UniProtKB/Swiss-Prot annotation:
Residues 2-113 form the CoV Nsp1 globular domain. This is Host translation inhibitor nsp1. The chain holds residues 11 to 125 of 7096 of the full protein. It is found in: Host cytoplasm. Inhibits host translation by associating with the open head conformation of the 40S subunit. The C-terminus binds to and obstructs ribosomal mRNA entry tunnel. Thereby inhibits antiviral response triggered by innate immunity or interferons. The nsp1-40S ribosome complex further induces an endonucleolytic cleavage near the 5'UTR of host mRNAs, targeting them for degradation. This inhibits the integrated stress response (ISR) in the infected cell by preventing EIF2S1/eIF2-alpha phosphorylation upstream of stress granule formation and depletes host G3BP1. Residues 1-113 are annotated as: Disordered. The gene is rep. It comes from Severe acute respiratory syndrome coronavirus 2 (2019-nCoV). Changing residue 37 to R: In strain: Omicron/XBB.1.5, Omicron/EG.5.1. It comes from the Viruses.
Length: 113
């Protein structure tokens, strides 16, 4: 399937134990996709002071369209030193590994895979 329905656990930035996916744009996008597939991916909602507490490169989920079955259609965009790899809509948040942190909410997305 070109798209997969996911429910992403929303984590508080100060709870997150593994603060990024890796060391290159290509690695973080690869790892993010693997974690999304394995259900081991969390979402941190971006506000003032969140991104400096996480590790670059960042992986964002961005709205790709204006929402089947409650699931917002999203795609992956990475960022390293102010340059983004991909072009998409509004940021829904930054992806991180989920290693058992308690979420505050869930974000229903349809992931272009």
């Amino acid at each position: 399937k070109t798209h997969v329905q996911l429910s992403l656990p929303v984590l508080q930035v100060r709870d997150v134990l593994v603060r990024g996916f890796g060391d290159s744009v290509e690695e973080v996008l690869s790892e993010a996709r693997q974690h999304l597939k394995d259900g081991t991916c969390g979402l941190v909602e971006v506000e003032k002071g969140v991104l400096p507490q996480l590790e670059q490169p960042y992986v964002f989920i961005k709205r790709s369209d204006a929402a089947p079955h409650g699931h917002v259609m999203v795609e992956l965009v990475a960022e390293l030193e102010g340059i983004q790899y991909g072009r998409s809509g509004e940021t829904l948040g930054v992806l991180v590994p989920h290693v058992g942190e308690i979420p505050v909410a869930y974000r229903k997305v349809l992931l272009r895979k």
